[PDB]
Amino acid sequence: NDALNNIINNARDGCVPLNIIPLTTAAKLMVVIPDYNTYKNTCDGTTFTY
Amino acid sequence: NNELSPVALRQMSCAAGTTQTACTDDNALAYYNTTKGGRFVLALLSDLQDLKWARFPKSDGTGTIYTELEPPCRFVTDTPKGPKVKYLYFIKGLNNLNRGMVLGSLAATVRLQ
Amino acid sequence: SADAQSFLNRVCGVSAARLTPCGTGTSTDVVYRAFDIYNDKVAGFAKFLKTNCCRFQEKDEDDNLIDSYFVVKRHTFSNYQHEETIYNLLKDCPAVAKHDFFKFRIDGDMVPHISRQRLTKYTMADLVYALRHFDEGNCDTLKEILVTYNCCDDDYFNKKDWYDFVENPDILRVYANLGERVRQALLKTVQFCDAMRNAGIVGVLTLDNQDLNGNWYDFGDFIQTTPGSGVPVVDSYYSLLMPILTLTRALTAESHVDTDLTKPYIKWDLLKYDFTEERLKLFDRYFKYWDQTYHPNCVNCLDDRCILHCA
Numbered sequence: 507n508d509a510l511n512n513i514i515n516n517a518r519d520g521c522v523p524l525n526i527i528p529l530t531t532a533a534k535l536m537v538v539i540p541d542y543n544t545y546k547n548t549c550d551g552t553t554f555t556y
Numbered sequence: 557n558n559e560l561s562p563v564a565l566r567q568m569s570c571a572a573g574t575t576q577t578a579c580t581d582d583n584a585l586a587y588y589n590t591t592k593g594g595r596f597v598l599a600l601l602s603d604l605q606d607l608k609w610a611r612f613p614k615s616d617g618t619g620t621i622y623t624e625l626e627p628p629c630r631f632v633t634d635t636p637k638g639p640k641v642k643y644l645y646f647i648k649g650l651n652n653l654n655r656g657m658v659l660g661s662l663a664a665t666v667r668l669q
Numbered sequence: 670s671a672d673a674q675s676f677l678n679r680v681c682g683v684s685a686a687r688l689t690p691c692g693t694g695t696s697t698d699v700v701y702r703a704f705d706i707y708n709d710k711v712a713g714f715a716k717f718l719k720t721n722c723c724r725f726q727e728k729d730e731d732d733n734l735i736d737s738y739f740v741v742k743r744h745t746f747s748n749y750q751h752e753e754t755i756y757n758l759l760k761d762c763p764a765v766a767k768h769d770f771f772k773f774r775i776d777g778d779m780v781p782h783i784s785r786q787r788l789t790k791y792t793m794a795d796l797v798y799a800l801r802h803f804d805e806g807n808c809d810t811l812k813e814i815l816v817t818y819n820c821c822d823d824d825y826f827n828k829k830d831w832y833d834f835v836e837n838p839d840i841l842r843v844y845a846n847l848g849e850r851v852r853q854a855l856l857k858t859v860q861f862c863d864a865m866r867n868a869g870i871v872g873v874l875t876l877d878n879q880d881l882n883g884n885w886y887d888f889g890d891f892i893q894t895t896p897g898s899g900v901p902v903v904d905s906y907y908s909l910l911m912p913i914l915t916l917t918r919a920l921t922a923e924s925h926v927d928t929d930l931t932k933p934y935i936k937w938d939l940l941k942y943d944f945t946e947e948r949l950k951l952f953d954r955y956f957k958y959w960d961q962t963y964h965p966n967c968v969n970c971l972d973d974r975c976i977l978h979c980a
């Protein structure tokens with residue numbers, strides 16, 4: 507209830523799209539990888555950016 | 557060719573004003589069209605210089621609509637009379653094809669300037 | 670003797686005019702093309718057979734043919750004066766092809782010709798007809814159009830099911846290469862409508878009077894009115910062209926910074942959801958003379974027909 511409040515107050519009338527709430531306030535991320543070629547382009551190493 | 561209304565149309569008669577009930581007897585060469593479902597006028601011509609309103613009578617007589625007009629345009633005509641000036645109007649909301657129809661017929665059947 | 674080699678250098682203008690005849694002498698050329706007709710006894714959108722035209726392709730420095738034609742048409746003397754007057758009124762628009770009126774004798778009499786310069790081989794109805802009446806048994810026009818504009822190469826069609834949408838979904842990427850041409854054609858159409866309104870000319874716009882570069886011609890069915898009171902009729906044009914606007918994705922350039930396909934994308938904030946003004950700006954930019962009220966939000970519509978129209 508702090509990140510959600512922080513992004514709610516920035517809205518000009520209190521309404522925000524639902525598709526950007528997990529994108530900016532979630533704490534955990536889950537990735538499903540088909541094969542190794544896709545793996546080495548998305549989550550290579552120990553830290554990645556998304 | 558895609559052309560603009562070969563078979564033409566017929567007629568122009570009746571009235572006009574500027575503030576609702578200002579239409580007294582007849583102040584408009586209200587032009588054209590008697591459609592197949594009933595008389596539906598297209599173009600308005602005015603020997604006067606400023607009108608915002610008209611009242612065309614039809615069928616029942618009790619049903620005669622107080623039409624809202626639009627800002628006018630002006631031109632001079634090549635009539636045998638000589639110097640003759642009107643101020644053109646169309647009934648508001650008239651789509652482009654209808655104005656093209658009446659303008660083409662007026663320009664190609666009768667002479668203007 | 671003379672004639673062919675004198676008509677050639679008379680059609681040859683004053684700019685560079687490296688011309689070559691399209692298998693003719695002084696006679697006309699016959700082709701099979703698509704038109705949009707309405708003349709009180711016939712109507713429709715079909716493929717008729719053109720009859721009165723002589724075409725000269727243009728060369729360049731290394732003597733290899735290019736996509737430029739000088740398509741002269743032969744018609745009536747009254748039509749000569751009418752078209753000359755309308756063109757003289759409309760010649761300053763940058764969206765109007767360059768006309769050239771001259772007179773030349775084929776016999777003891779003198780007949781008039783009208784020559785148009787630097788057109789393409791196909792028009793925009795040819796493209797619309799090819800895409801809206803698809804038949805894999807014979808689609809030569811579509812293949813020619815695709816290969817002459819660097820959308821693909823001639824060996825792309827050696828594949829089978831190259832046209833299918835479920836198999837080979839790469840045909841979408843192949844088709845999406847004409848969107849910029851379509852967008853430039855739309856902009857030139859808006860320019861032409863503005864010029865017609867300012868000059869006081871009344872006429873109806875069809876797809877077969879515009880080539881694939883956007884230029885306009887054929888003012889044979891227009892009339893004249895007082896300046897500032899012109900009115901173009903653009904119903905059939907937009908209505909028939911509409912299904913092609915999404916197949917080729919013509920509005921892709923509108924997601925870039927300056928409507929330029931070489932700059933990065935626009936970065937909207939994630940909290941914006943209205944976009945009610947961008948829709949109006951797009952409508953005013955690409956559909957200015959479409960005369961029917963447009964509601965960005967379908968909650969203000971009057972009935973189901975208006976809902977369909979605005980959706």
Ligand SMILES: Nc1nc2c(ncn2[C@@H]2O[C@H](COP(=O)(O)OP(=O)(O)OP(=O)(O)O)[C@@H](O)[C@H]2O)c(=O)[nH]1
Pocket residue numbers: 557700702703719722724738740742788789790791792877878879880881887889890
């Ligand atoms: N762009 C282009 N069109 C061509 C060519 N050859 C034939 N055409 C066809 O020929 C037409 C050339 O224009 P016009 O014949 O002036 O058009 P139109 O609408 O038939 O003319 P009017 O009968 O005078 O109203 C186009 O509609 C094309 O369909 C060509 O080399 N280039």
Ligand SMILES: [Zn+2]
Pocket residue numbers: 962963964967969970971975976978979
């Ligand atoms: Zn609506």
